[PDB]
Amino acid sequence: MMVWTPVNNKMFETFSYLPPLTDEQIAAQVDYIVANGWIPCLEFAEADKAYVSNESAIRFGSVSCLYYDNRYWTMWKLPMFGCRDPMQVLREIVACTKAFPDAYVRLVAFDNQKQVQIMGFLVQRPKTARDFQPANKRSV
Amino acid sequence: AGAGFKAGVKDYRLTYYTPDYVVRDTDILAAFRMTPQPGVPPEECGAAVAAESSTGTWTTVWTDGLTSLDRYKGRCYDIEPVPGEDNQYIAYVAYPIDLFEEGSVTNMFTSIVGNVFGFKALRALRLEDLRIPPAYVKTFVGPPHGIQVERDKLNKYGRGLLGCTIKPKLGLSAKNYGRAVYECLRGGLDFTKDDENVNSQPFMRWRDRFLFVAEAIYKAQAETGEVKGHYLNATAGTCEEMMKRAVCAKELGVPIIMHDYLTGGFTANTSLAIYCRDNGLLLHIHRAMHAVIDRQRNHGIHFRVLAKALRMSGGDHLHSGTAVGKLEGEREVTLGFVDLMRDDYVEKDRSRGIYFTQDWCSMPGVMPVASGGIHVWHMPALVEIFGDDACLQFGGGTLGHPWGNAPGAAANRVALEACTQARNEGRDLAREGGDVIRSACKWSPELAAACEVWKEIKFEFDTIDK
Amino acid sequence: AGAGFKAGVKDYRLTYYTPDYVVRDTDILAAFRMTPQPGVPPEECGAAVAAESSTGTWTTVWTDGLTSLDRYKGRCYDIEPVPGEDNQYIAYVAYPIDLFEEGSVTNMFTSIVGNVFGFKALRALRLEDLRIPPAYVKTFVGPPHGIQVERDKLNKYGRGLLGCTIKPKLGLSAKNYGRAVYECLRGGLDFTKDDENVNSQPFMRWRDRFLFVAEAIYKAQAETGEVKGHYLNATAGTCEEMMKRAVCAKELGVPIIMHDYLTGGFTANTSLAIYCRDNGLLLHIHRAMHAVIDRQRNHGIHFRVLAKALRMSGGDHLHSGTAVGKLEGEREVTLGFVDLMRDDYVEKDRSRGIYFTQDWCSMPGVMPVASGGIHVWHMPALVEIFGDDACLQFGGGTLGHPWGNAPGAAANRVALEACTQARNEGRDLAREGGDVIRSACKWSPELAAACEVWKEIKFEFDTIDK
Amino acid sequence: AGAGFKAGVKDYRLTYYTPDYVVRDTDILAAFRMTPQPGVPPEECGAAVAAESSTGTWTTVWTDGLTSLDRYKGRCYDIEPVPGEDNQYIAYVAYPIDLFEEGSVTNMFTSIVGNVFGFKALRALRLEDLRIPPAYVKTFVGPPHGIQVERDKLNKYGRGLLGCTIKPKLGLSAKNYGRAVYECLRGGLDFTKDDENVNSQPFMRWRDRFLFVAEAIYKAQAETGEVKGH
Amino acid sequence: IVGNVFGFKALRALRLEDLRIPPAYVKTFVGPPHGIQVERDKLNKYGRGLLGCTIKPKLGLSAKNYGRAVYECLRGGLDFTKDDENVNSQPFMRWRDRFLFVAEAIYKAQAETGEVKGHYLNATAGTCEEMMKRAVCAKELGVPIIMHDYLTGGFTANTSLAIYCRDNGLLLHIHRAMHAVIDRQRNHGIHFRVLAKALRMSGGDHLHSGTAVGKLEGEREVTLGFVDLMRDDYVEKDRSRGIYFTQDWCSMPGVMPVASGGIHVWHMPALVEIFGDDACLQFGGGTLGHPWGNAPGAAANRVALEACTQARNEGRDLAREGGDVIRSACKWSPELAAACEVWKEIKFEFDTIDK
Numbered sequence A: 001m002m003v004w005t006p007v008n009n010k011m012f013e014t015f016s017y018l019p020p021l022t023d024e025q026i027a028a029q030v031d032y033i034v035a036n037g038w039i040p041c042l043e044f045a046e047a048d049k050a051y052v053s054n055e056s057a058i059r060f061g062s063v064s065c066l067y068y069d070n071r072y073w074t075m076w077k078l079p080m081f082g083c084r085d086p087m088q089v090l091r092e093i094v095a096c097t098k099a100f101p102d103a104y105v106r107l108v109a110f111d112n113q114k115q116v117q118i119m120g121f122l123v124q125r126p127k128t129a130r131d132f133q134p135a136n137k138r139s140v
Numbered sequence B, C: 001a002g003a004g005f006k007a008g009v010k011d012y013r014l015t016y017y018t019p020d021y022v023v024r025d026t027d028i029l030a031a032f033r034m035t036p037q038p039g040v041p042p043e044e045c046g047a048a049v050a051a052e053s054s055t056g057t058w059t060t061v062w063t064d065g066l067t068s069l070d071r072y073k074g075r076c077y078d079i080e081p082v083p084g085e086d087n088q089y090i091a092y093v094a095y096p097i098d099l100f101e102e103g104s105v106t107n108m109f110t111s112i113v114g115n116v117f118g119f120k121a122l123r124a125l126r127l128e129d130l131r132i133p134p135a136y137v138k139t140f141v142g143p144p145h146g147i148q149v150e151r152d153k154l155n156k157y158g159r160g161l162l163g164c165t166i167k168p169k170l171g172l173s174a175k176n177y178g179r180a181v182y183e184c185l186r187g188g189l190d191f192t193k194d195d196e197n198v199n200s201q202p203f204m205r206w207r208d209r210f211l212f213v214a215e216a217i218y219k220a221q222a223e224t225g226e227v228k229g230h231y232l233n234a235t236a237g238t239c240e241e242m243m244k245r246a247v248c249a250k251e252l253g254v255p256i257i258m259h260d261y262l263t264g265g266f267t268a269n270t271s272l273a274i275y276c277r278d279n280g281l282l283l284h285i286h287r288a289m290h291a292v293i294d295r296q297r298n299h300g301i302h303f304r305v306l307a308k309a310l311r312m313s314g315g316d317h318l319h320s321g322t323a324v325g326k327l328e329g330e331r332e333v334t335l336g337f338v339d340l341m342r343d344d345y346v347e348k349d350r351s352r353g354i355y356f357t358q359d360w361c362s363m364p365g366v367m368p369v370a371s372g373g374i375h376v377w378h379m380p381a382l383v384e385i386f387g388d389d390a391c392l393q394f395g396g397g398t399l400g401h402p403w404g405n406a407p408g409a410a411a412n413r414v415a416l417e418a419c420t421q422a423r424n425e426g427r428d429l430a431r432e433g434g435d436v437i438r439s440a441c442k443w444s445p446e447l448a449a450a451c452e453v454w455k456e457i458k459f460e461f462d463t464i465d466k
Numbered sequence D: 001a002g003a004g005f006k007a008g009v010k011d012y013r014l015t016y017y018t019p020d021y022v023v024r025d026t027d028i029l030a031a032f033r034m035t036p037q038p039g040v041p042p043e044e045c046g047a048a049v050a051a052e053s054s055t056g057t058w059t060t061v062w063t064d065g066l067t068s069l070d071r072y073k074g075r076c077y078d079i080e081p082v083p084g085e086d087n088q089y090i091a092y093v094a095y096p097i098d099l100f101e102e103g104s105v106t107n108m109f110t111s112i113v114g115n116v117f118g119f120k121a122l123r124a125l126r127l128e129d130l131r132i133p134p135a136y137v138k139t140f141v142g143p144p145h146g147i148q149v150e151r152d153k154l155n156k157y158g159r160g161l162l163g164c165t166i167k168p169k170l171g172l173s174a175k176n177y178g179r180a181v182y183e184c185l186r187g188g189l190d191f192t193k194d195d196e197n198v199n200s201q202p203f204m205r206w207r208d209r210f211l212f213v214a215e216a217i218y219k220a221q222a223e224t225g226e227v228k229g230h
Numbered sequence E: 001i002v003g004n005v006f007g008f009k010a011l012r013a014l015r016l017e018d019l020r021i022p023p024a025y026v027k028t029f030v031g032p033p034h035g036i037q038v039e040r041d042k043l044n045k046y047g048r049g050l051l052g053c054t055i056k057p058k059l060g061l062s063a064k065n066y067g068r069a070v071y072e073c074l075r076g077g078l079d080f081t082k083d084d085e086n087v088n089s090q091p092f093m094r095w096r097d098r099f100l101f102v103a104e105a106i107y108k109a110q111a112e113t114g115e116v117k118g119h120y121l122n123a124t125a126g127t128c129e130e131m132m133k134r135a136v137c138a139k140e141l142g143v144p145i146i147m148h149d150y151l152t153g154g155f156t157a158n159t160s161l162a163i164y165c166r167d168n169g170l171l172l173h174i175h176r177a178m179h180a181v182i183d184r185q186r187n188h189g190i191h192f193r194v195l196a197k198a199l200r201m202s203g204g205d206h207l208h209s210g211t212a213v214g215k216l217e218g219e220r221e222v223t224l225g226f227v228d229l230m231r232d233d234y235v236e237k238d239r240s241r242g243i244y245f246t247q248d249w250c251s252m253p254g255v256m257p258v259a260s261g262g263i264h265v266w267h268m269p270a271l272v273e274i275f276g277d278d279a280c281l282q283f284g285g286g287t288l289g290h291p292w293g294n295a296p297g298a299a300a301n302r303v304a305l306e307a308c309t310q311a312r313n314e315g316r317d318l319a320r321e322g323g324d325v326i327r328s329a330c331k332w333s334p335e336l337a338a339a340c341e342v343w344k345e346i347k348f349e350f351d352t353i354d355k
């Protein structure tokens, strides 16, 4: 029996339970976006704004149901409407991570027919992050 | 003298069988699978069904003349023979929109399925489908939130949601319930849930459960940094008790409650859906009792009708079946009603049991929930059947893991994410599914332990609801 | 003695088949007519039903060890073969009283019939009967009034009550509705009623109906000097709307309202029954949709269970079927559940489909209502089957009379009183019924007209629910 | 590269004038009598009205790409010249049912007549008619009773109803108001009425009026044997 | 006053131009929930016009995307964003979902910028009961401001809402949807100055006033006239600005004029010159139409406003030097330069109907 650690084991939604995505695996996800005609977009946040929190609820009556702070991140430029080139997305990842080397960065994609985000995963975490485990240390 | 009152009995077909009727775009249409008694013509049987579900009774009444029967009568307008059956027919009935109370699923069922199933003149009757026109759809509040808004509120995208029913079904204390919930949620599941029959009982009263579950949700959320929920059961003996439970959930700030819509009933469900809309609670719907009604091919109401009814009455999630699990549900039929649950416009497709084109006129879609006897080996098939817009629930498949709930939850989460990644990379889960899970097993010890335990476990039986 | 947790799947029968169990007087007992898939032993099938309706799931869970499975598990304790069937069995299951929420029919159904009907491992399942122990019965409010109190409030004794459903079912205006009601009531009927599907619709909104019907009730009562009523339908899309309708009835001072308990639901019904108790309204229960569930021999829930459930949830009247009318209901089966509805103590009697002795521990009786395709010639048979403690309803049989509603009502009232008198005088209605009616015909012109119109009208078909 | 975001102003007609559109039976339709400024084509004016009463503004916005403009846009689908007029046109506009709040006349007006009447590019605008589809009609409670039920409640059939507004419009006391009501009703009128501007005022407070009027109604009813109202 | 007389056969046309509301009648009204001074004090905003922005497209965005757009606008330097007048509750976006996501956006932008932020959440509804439910939710979220379409909702509903706002400390923004149906033509209807007086009495903290220079009609002199009627305590008769009667407001709080509709950065000097500091200037298309997105769009408008304000304070004449002020700011701010390039040639110059 192995024990799933509760200490410094924060996750990051889709694909965070798999091995970290290689550059080839990221490229494959980007190809999938383009193949389906979805709209790629990058979003980023400083460490203090990365995970869901409750601070604004101090201002509320009994209306906190499904309210969380830090769901919104900050948009990098604009969604890439009309993008049919995977290399353009990859170049924007490089540009965003270069401008904000200490930020969390996630790649998302939108479907304008359902009008909902249809994919999303983390592509950068700050080097100073120490609230997560390598795959092989998630259980003890 | 014109047409006056003549007392006495005459054939239903004289008034209610209208084969040349052109249906109106506001009519509610019903497809009944009808088995007449010997010596009863299909036309008379169809006419009888139309009559006794609308305006008519067994003998002529004088009061008909004060109104316009033409305006109000249900009309049997087509009868199809059933291939492979000597005494089965599909009778199509059109009902004027004027017959129905706006916003009331209760009223719709009371007319269409109220009395006709008990008629001596038929041996069996099954309601296969209903065409709910946009003019009637628009009278309903519908789902409190629906698929898009739910994902947006939870901040969860790009994969199916994962859930788990706490087990044993009954017998755990409130504290142990919360303990199990915490351990499941912290391992990678998005949701846990009360079993359908967990309401308030001597072994665990509801408010005690709600509070401990609240503690568990918030603990798991802080630990993982992902939004977590537990479907707290609001199902109760009275509307007043049901509402008290919903209010407590609101006051705890938790995201989601559940209701057994068939055993609680449509009247209570619609009230709860309205409360959820007004207070921002997600509403998970359990279909307890549906198989009493929808299992047999010859008699009852097909689940696709019960699913349309729920979408109108209101729910954010609805159990859809798994196809591969311990409970029955044929693949093609399931694909059909899943579209009816999720999509805006569904074209007629008899190969998937869709008898009528259904236009939902922008009513939000309902998240299908696949649950019951599923485990990690089913993951590829489940992702292939449902895609991302579904919740997959593992009760036994989590609390039955040899290392406990958190490793159990992690195994399911790893399996789901591995299959999702593989699909995204262009792999065919229908053919490569086994390979995907085997590769993930070699990588994840939690997953490897689950795969070993349930490797040989399958549920393969002859299908009744064909 | 504790044992280690062992992950994996084992047979249900290892835990849930307990043939030596001696049932406790507080246990809820269920009799299931079970049809297993080929290759599934009856013991395993019975154990699966017991397991999945109580505490168990498809694989072993560790959490069982935190509680006492012995204390909480449902137990298949007996299996009977079904004479005349090769693959049908009666499985008896016992459920500890601790499993159930006090006062909640919703909860009881959710456990017992929630999921098990959909199991792949069975081909069909029917719940035939339930033994509700006194200890659980006592947790329910039950009927707002019951047979004795109803008779005392209405001041009506010594004969069956007579009623009538207004027709056409739908399409009449509120004013014409009230007009029909007044004419029916003034002719000798005790009650009239909204059809089950008359709620609030474009052609007639509910409050308009309620006011005009109030005028009609009070007019007929002043005219005849007998207490009159009309079952005003409270069935609605939401609990809030249902309650608004009940409140209006209260404020008009009228005696009785109705509710469609299966289409509205148990949660709504229980709330309405409680409201009716607290405000002194009689509550008539319509069983719309029951035949979807209760028609077929091999699958569903027998009406006797639905009737017990209603007696617990609450209703002063419940539709019972006629046996002789347009809708199915076998005589022996009907006499069985009529006793279950009315009596305090009903002994086991398999010849009438009573699987368990039922002790109602002073819970009030529910008045059976015979309705559907009946007319004057049926009167002797109805008085013989039901006796005085019943309501007999003639919709078509009143509004279909050649001279109109008041003569139609008078004809039915004369027929009833003639049969009642004849019985009291020692005549055998089973043999002399025809003679009683013919004698009354020669005396009453109103009755003579009714007898002529419907003389040849019978409903005789092969019975499905045998 | 597909259609993407291009900042800047373009003609409304490029998006909002769709002369080949086949209207849906769920669409709300509007007929506008439109008088364009000199130098503004009718098509551009009609497009402007459709745009600014639905989804569009004066310059291109990037957020359009997150949704489906095709699904939501108002569409000018026909333009008729007005006979006898040199600069008047009937522009027909179709609005998806999705644009409107169910049961809210307020919302319907806010969209259709909210801002477009003030556009510099037009000299005048008149909304002539609206096609309210059954799917939208059914979302409204509508009249509390309607003609048939009203006749039924009042027990009045076979002739027009007769009413009377109390005069002078303002200035009468509650007691004198009731006195005038009684005398009108008893002579054969079915109804009397408060003048539109009689609400509650220094010369006559509303509750005082209501009570005296009640006395008058019941007096006239008892005297004539016919149902009366005010 | 306007109930029946406009339909008299004996007249061909009738227009109500002005009303003198005497102090004795003014004093019977609750009036604006807060008014200009109190609003500035609550928001802690002084020394410049307020800046706002209507989210676009008008209809069709989901609640989540609405909040996303709001956050990006507010974080770039706008004080407020707003629901479009016709955004109430619809299949594509139900109101309570919007309110919650917008609340998240407001609080995020506020924490990021360190300035108080708001979004006018639309309470306009089909019934008074629905309207009040929406106002209550705004109260329970602790957000500063709601809006109402006073002519399409109606005066009875507006007055109720204003009273609720006073009692619960919510600011009330008033949209004048439908006013041009009534107030456009010279020969017939009711002049907007009367509709503005009526709103000041019924109650509102902000009211749309027109722009003069934007896509919707509004002559300069007439506008200056009713802006004084909206803001000031005492306004003397002045026929050159359409003021027919001296109006004494007897200390009833003033209403903040809101200039909105087809305006962009090049209009900024003219707007600051017309309105001064006691106004809100709203840029819908002028923010969400910026080539770099909402935050840079907001920043461009904010820089333009602050540059004009500084220039005025330093003694520069915005009527003459306005172009120079903007051009200098363009050379300094890349965000502003991008906006200036896109809308350089865009003007709305047509013959005025309401002369």
Ligand SMILES: O=C(O)[C@@](O)(COP(=O)(O)O)[C@H](O)[C@H](O)COP(=O)(O)O
Binding pocket: B165, B167, B195, B196, B287, B288, B319, B320, B321, B322, B327, B369, B370, B371, B372, B373, B374, B393, B394, B395, B396, B397, C052, C057, C058, C115, C118
């Ligand atoms: O009670 C149960 O059996 C479950 O909790 C599953 O438990 P396991 O995960 O342990 O199998 C679900 O309620 C059923 O799947 C419902 O069936 P359906 O979804 O078909 O309505």
Ligand SMILES: O=C(O)[C@@](O)(COP(=O)(O)O)[C@H](O)[C@H](O)COP(=O)(O)O
Binding pocket: B052, B057, B058, B115, B118, C165, C167, C195, C196, C287, C288, C319, C320, C321, C322, C326, C327, C369, C370, C371, C372, C373, C374, C393, C394, C395, C396, C397
């Ligand atoms: O809708 C009808 O058909 C009835 O009004 C009877 O009308 P008639 O009197 O004109 O036949 C009753 O509701 C049914 O008898 C209900 O069946 P049951 O009592 O078996 O539940």
Ligand SMILES: O=C(O)[C@@](O)(COP(=O)(O)O)[C@H](O)[C@H](O)COP(=O)(O)O
Binding pocket: D052, D057, D058, D115, D118, E054, E056, E084, E085, E176, E177, E208, E209, E210, E211, E215, E216, E258, E259, E260, E261, E262, E263, E282, E283, E284, E285, E286
């Ligand atoms: O719907 C619109 O057009 C606006 O949101 C402006 O959008 P833009 O900023 O994109 O132009 C405003 O509601 C109008 O200005 C109202 O007019 P007024 O202020 O004259 O009442």
Ligand SMILES: [Mg+2]
Binding pocket: B165, B195, B196, B197
């Ligand atoms: Mg369950």
Ligand SMILES: [Mg+2]
Binding pocket: C165, C195, C196, C197
């Ligand atoms: Mg009936």
Ligand SMILES: [Mg+2]
Binding pocket: D165, D195, D196, D197
């Ligand atoms: Mg008048």
Ligand SMILES: [Mg+2]
Binding pocket: E054, E084, E085, E086
């Ligand atoms: Mg606007």
